[PDB]
Amino acid sequence: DEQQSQAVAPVYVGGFLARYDQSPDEAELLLPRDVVEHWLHAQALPLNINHDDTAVVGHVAAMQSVRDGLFCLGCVTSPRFLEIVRRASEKSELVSRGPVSPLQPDKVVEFLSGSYAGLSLSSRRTTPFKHVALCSVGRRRGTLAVYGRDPEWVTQRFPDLTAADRDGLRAQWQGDPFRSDSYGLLGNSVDALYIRERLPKLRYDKQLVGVTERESYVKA
Amino acid sequence: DEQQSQAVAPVYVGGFLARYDQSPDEAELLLPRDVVEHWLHAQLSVALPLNINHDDTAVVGHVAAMQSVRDGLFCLGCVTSPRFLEIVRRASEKSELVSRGPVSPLQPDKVVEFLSGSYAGLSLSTPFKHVALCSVGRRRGTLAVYGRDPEWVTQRFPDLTAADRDGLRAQWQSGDPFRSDSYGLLGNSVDALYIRERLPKLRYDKQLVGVTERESYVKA
Numbered sequence: 246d247e248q249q250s251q252a253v254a255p256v257y258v259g260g261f262l263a264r265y266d267q268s269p270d271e272a273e274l275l276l277p278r279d280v281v282e283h284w285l286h287a288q289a290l291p292l293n294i295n296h297d298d299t300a301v302v303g304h305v306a307a308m309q310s311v312r313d314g315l316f317c318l319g320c321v322t323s324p325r326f327l328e329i330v331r332r333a334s335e336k337s338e339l340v341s342r343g344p345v346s347p348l349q350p351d352k353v354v355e356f357l358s359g360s361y362a363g364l365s366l367s368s369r370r371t372t373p374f375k376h377v378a379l380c381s382v383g384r385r386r387g388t389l390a391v392y393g394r395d396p397e398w399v400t401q402r403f404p405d406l407t408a409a410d411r412d413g414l415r416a417q418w419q420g421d422p423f424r425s426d427s428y429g430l431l432g433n434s435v436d437a438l439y440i441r442e443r444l445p446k447l448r449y450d451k452q453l454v455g456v457t458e459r460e461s462y463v464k465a
Numbered sequence: 466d467e468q469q470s471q472a473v474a475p476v477y478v479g480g481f482l483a484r485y486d487q488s489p490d491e492a493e494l495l496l497p498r499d500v501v502e503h504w505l506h507a508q509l510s511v512a513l514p515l516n517i518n519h520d521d522t523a524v525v526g527h528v529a530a531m532q533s534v535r536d537g538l539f540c541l542g543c544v545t546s547p548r549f550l551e552i553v554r555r556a557s558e559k560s561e562l563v564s565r566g567p568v569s570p571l572q573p574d575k576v577v578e579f580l581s582g583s584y585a586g587l588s589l590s591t592p593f594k595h596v597a598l599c600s601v602g603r604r605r606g607t608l609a610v611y612g613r614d615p616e617w618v619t620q621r622f623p624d625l626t627a628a629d630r631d632g633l634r635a636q637w638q639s640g641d642p643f644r645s646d647s648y649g650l651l652g653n654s655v656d657a658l659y660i661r662e663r664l665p666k667l668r669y670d671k672q673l674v675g676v677t678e679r680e681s682y683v684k685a
């Protein structure tokens with residue numbers, strides 16, 4: 246179908262796992278710069294959906310401790326998951342509405358942006374970093390997830406990131422591990438509809454990291 | 466086995482398809498008393514359909530009865546689609562929210578609970594084309610209530626009276642109309658995530674109807 250093949254091509258996601266200049270909503274969420282660097286120094290991390298270990302869609306391509314926090318670049322690859330995503334997008338009035346001004350329509354990308362707008366990192370206090378999860382909203386703030394086809398392009402979606410930053414990241418990115426089904430994704434969709442302060446929180450995150458959404462596929 | 470057949474049993478729902486004591490913060494619609502009365506009373510009366518968010522290819526059943534009452538229009542529909550229910554039941558097995566179950570002495574009912582969190586609201590589309598189950602309604606006091614026994618659900622709403630229940634009750638006493646699929650509902654899923662102030666709205670209709678000061682399956 247050609248098209249049905251462009252869609253199901255890998256999709257990168259990027260964003261902060263934690264923003265240093267931000268005090269967690271809970272003590273457990275404490276993750277200071279000092280800890281991060283020591284950890285990264287030691288400890289490929291899995292990329293799943295809502296922490297469900299039975300819904301791994303790809304892997305983490307890069308982790309980096311920049312200035313304002315910890316930043317990762319993940320890659321979605323699971324053709325099983327991507328297909329479903331392609332199927333669902335086809336029936337989303339949001340996706341159908343298209344993206345902002347000069348950006349070209351990418352249903353599978355847009356749908357994930359609308360669906361898992363945040364990034365949640367599984368940690369401990371071998372390998373303190375368990376995995377990264379795409380979710381409707383991170384528990385930490387500034388964890389907006391940004392989806393795009395070009396990894397270079399998703400990185401350029403964050404002002405705080407410097408040329409030096411992308412250097413260290415580029416020097417990182419350069420079968421189907423999924424195990425759930427659409428029914429599963431569906432069930433997860435309701436849990437998402439009852440998270441308090443979601444959209445407000447998502448918006449707060451945008452402003453916090455500069456993703457105007459008039460430059461990305463962010464839907465909040 | 467066995468219970469899965471019990472869950473895939475028909476489900477009832479009801480609520481105000483309009484609140485007379487309410488002014489649409491968005492005119493357009495308009496429900497004024499004399500209207501409906503004049504409108505319901507017309508033409509027995511042909512089967513009104515029930516669909517997910519107006520998707521004529523996502524029919525789940527029919528409205529079983531409607532009645533003009535003390536504070537607005539109130540309808541009790543019946544969700545029957547063996548195909549629709551089957552999905553909702555597999556999705557339910559994969560929902561943390563549903564996993565946590567109901568309150569105080571209410572027994573668990575995944576299928577009911579899933580619908581409860583997914584289509585908290587009722588929407589009215591002969592003038593009355595169809596009633597639709599959706600994540601929320603533009604017209605306030607649209608909060609939907611799922612139950613296995615109609616009388617039970619009616620019993621959830623205080624404003625109602627034996628009198629009212631009389632008429633309603635007097636009312637509810639082919640093939641699989643559903644045409645959509647899990648991807649379809651999934652697709653509608655994100656669209657829902659973007660309705661501004663869904664919960665705060667939802668919570669409102671909860672007290673606006675008194676269902677807060679009682680026990681139900683409402684997840685709001």
Ligand SMILES: *[C@@](O)(C(=O)N[C@H](CC)c1ccccc1)[C@H](C)NC(=O)[C@H](CC(=O)N(C)C)NC(=O)[C@@H](NC(=O)[C@@H](NC(=O)CCCCCN)C(C)(C)C)C(C)(C)C
Binds near residue numbers: 365381382383384
């Ligand atoms: C993340 O943003 C998130 O969970 N978001 C979700 C999206 C649905 C969300 C939740 C509520 C409201 C809105 C959104 C958030 C930053 N991450 C977590 O909360 C994360 C979840 C997780 O990993 N799982 C659910 C598996 N939690 C953690 O990473 C925590 N890690 C642990 O608790 C680890 N525990 C230990 O290392 C010792 C446990 C000792 C037990 C007794 N022996 C572990 C093994 C469970 C990963 C914290 C790092 C936050 C503590």
